[PDB]
């Protein structure tokens, strides 16, 4: 946490995965942002960097807010690495400022299998 130490944030919660009553998709997390009670009021937090703290090792996972959900201020997010079920009910930080974390906020299928036709170069 020695990089995001001084960074102030808006609070959020990880409530669950995207699901129906039959199926559950662990690629996308459902997230609640305080003060956001309307679908239209999600524009301002849309596309923003977010993070969660995984207890073990004390380190954060970085991610981005991608899309609204419902009529009531819920959002979808994709994290660098999909999340464990243990982390439900925990807090999420929405950063007010900018941080360059490079490639470390983007999901794994987009990182690899994204098709730039990345030829394995072998030097």
């Amino acid at each position: 946490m020695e990089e995001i130490k001084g960074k102030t944030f808006l609070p959020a919660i990880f409530v669950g995965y995207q699901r129906s009553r039959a199926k559950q998709r662990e690629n996308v997390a459902l997230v609640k942002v305080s003060g956001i009670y309307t679908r239209a009021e999600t524009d301002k937090v849309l596309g923003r960097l977010i993070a969660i703290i995984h207890s073990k090792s004390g380190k954060p996972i970085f991610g981005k807010i991608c899309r609204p959900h419902g009529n009531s201020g819920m959002v979808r997010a994709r994290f660098y690495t999909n999340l464990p079920g243990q982390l439900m009910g925990h807090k999420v930080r929405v950063f007010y400022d900018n941080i360059d974390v490079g490639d470390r906020a983007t999901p794994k299928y987009e990182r690899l299998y994204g098709n730039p036709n990345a030829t394995v170069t072998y030097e």
Partner: protein, 195 residues
């Protein structure tokens, strides 16, 4: 990660229960005080017959395996909340362990800040002609042993806090005189720019 303390005077049982259950599943600690002053709509007699019909259901061959029916308002509220939680999982059990429910206000909560939930209070929910009753009285009819004790304790503490508020009045008149910290005015103006 504070606690939310809710004063259950005035509120509808099912509507407050739904709120508390969702709040618990978001990883919040919640206490509820004055559970015998919560409200169930309908005639008191209809409520009474409903709770006695509930009480008739027990395991035929051994009643120690059966549903247990609690008689105090706090545990009635707690059973109603369990009805809305998935408690047989680890997640549901953690949500349960985060709750607390009380008859009256005990000293462990006597200095917390209470809040209300007006969208679940009966004076906003029920039509003026609808009958209504409070949980304490149903509990007294089904077997709760401690109505008079809670009333004596409530009387004493209300008198004590009525004394306290008189000092609180003047203590605020000193606090409020802090219209003389310009290191605060120099930013109340900034607050105003945005409000």
């Amino acid at each position: 990660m504070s606690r939310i303390v809710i004063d259950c005077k005035g509120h509808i049982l099912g509507r407050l229960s739904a709120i508390v259950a969702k709040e618990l599943l978001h990883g919040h600690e919640v206490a509820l005080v004055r559970c015998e002053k919560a409200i169930i709509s309908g005639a008191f007699r209809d409520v009474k017959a409903h709770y006695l019909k509930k009480m008739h259901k027990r395991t035929n061959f051994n009643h120690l395996r059966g549903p247990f029916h609690f008689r105090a308002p706090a545990e009635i509220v707690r059973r109603t909340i369990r009805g809305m939680i998935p408690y047989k999982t680890v997640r549901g059990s953690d949500a349960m362990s985060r709750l607390r429910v009380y008859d009256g206000i005990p000293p462990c909560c006597a200095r917390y800040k209470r809040v209300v939930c007006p969208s679940a209070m009966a004076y906003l929910c029920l039509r003026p002609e609808r009958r209504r009753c409070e949980v304490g009285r149903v509990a007294h009819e089904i077997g709760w042993q401690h109505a008079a004790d809670v009333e004596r304790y409530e009387k004493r503490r209300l008198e004590e806090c009525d004394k306290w508020y008189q000092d609180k009045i003047q203590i605020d008149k000193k606090i409020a005189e802090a219209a003389e910290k310009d290191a605060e005015l120099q930013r109340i103006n900034a607050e105003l720019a945005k409000y």
